[PDB]
Amino acid sequence: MKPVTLYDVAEYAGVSYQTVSRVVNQASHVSAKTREKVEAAMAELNYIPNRCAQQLAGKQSL
Amino acid sequence: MKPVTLYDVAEYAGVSYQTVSRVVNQASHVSAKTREKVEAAMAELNYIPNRCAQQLAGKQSL
DNA sequence: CGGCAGTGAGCGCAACGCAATTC
DNA sequence: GAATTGCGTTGCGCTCACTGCCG
Numbered sequence A, B: 001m002k003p004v005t006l007y008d009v010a011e012y013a014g015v016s017y018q019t020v021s022r023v024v025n026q027a028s029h030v031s032a033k034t035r036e037k038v039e040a041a042m043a044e045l046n047y048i049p050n051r052c053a054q055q056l057a058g059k060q061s062l
Numbered sequence C: 001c002g003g004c005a006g007t008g009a010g011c012g013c014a015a016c017g018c019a020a021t022t023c
Numbered sequence D: 001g002a003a004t005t006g007c008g009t010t011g012c013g014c015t016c017a018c019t020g021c022c023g
Helices: A006-013 A018-023 A032-045 A053-058 B008-013 B017-025 B035-044
Strands: none
Touching: A006 A018, A006 A032, A018 A032, B008 B017, B008 B035, B017 B035
């Protein structure tokens, strides 16, 4: 009925959303405490980068 | 890559971006004389009406 | 006044930047 | 002392749909 959404992982992790997807995107100065939770959320809901809102968001390819 | 979307094909045909997409969704009364014209222009300019954008667009599923 | 096109807005993830604050 | 948090949006194509543009 309903697939996965980044917003779900954000709320499950209890973080500012940005910190979640940045771990699989380009995490740099993220505290171990912060990544600890977001990893749990990403693995819990199974976060798969879908090809839809990626091209549209303004990627290097439409 | 060239960001030629329904916005660029509009001016090229002398219309808006709705006449262009008109044939992509249903292809109803497209001016009656510009139905095949836009379709041809699409193939000519190698215009690609996305792949997943039209899905998240006009969802109306909520 | 009537046909038929055009604009408007929303959906989703992704990214920028410098200093104060917390660990 | 050095890590680390953030903010908050747009915005893009693309859709529908009603309403206005041009006649």
